[PDB]
Amino acid sequence: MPHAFKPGDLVFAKMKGYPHWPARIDDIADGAVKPPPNKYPIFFFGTHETAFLGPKDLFPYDKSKDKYGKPNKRKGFNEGLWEIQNNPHASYS
């Protein structure tokens, strides 16, 4: 049975106008801008962008990889696929 999301959880994260994108729940570093209530800081692999998402847009990686874990035409996407598969917990700063 699922827990709530925690820092380090890998997901595909859905934003409007983007395909489900390889992403992880980032930790909030000392001194970093905190998310709004009920939002997680999402670090998107490949683009290395952050956005704040709620769980409705967060699809746990292992369950969803069969569906979303396929190359995409979009910038940084396949790079993102490599990172989530090969080194999801590294520093990309």
Q: What is the DSSP string of 15-80?
A: -TTS--EEEEEPPPPTTSPPPPTT-EEEEETTT--EEEE-GGGEEEHHHHHHHH-S--SSTTHHHH
Q: Hey, which residues does 37 pair with through a beta bridge? A: none
Single-letter amino acid code for the residue at 66 = D
The correct CATH number of 23-28+39-88 out of 3.40.50.10610, 3.10.20.520, 3.40.50.620, 2.30.30.140 is 2.30.30.140
Task: Report in angstroms the alpha-carbon separations of 91 from 18, 26, 45, 54, 59.
Answer: 24, 10, 11, 23, 22
Single-letter amino acid code for the residue at 56 = K
Domain range annotation of the chain: 23-28+39-88
* Rg of the chain over all Cα atoms, to the nearest angstrom: 12
Buried b (16+ CB within 10 A) or exposed e, 6-36: eeebbbbbbeeeeebbbbbbbeeeeeeeebe
Q: Hey, which residues does 53 pair with through a beta bridge? A: 40
* Resolution of the experimental model, in Å, one decimal: 1.8
- Check residue 11 and report its DSSP letter: E
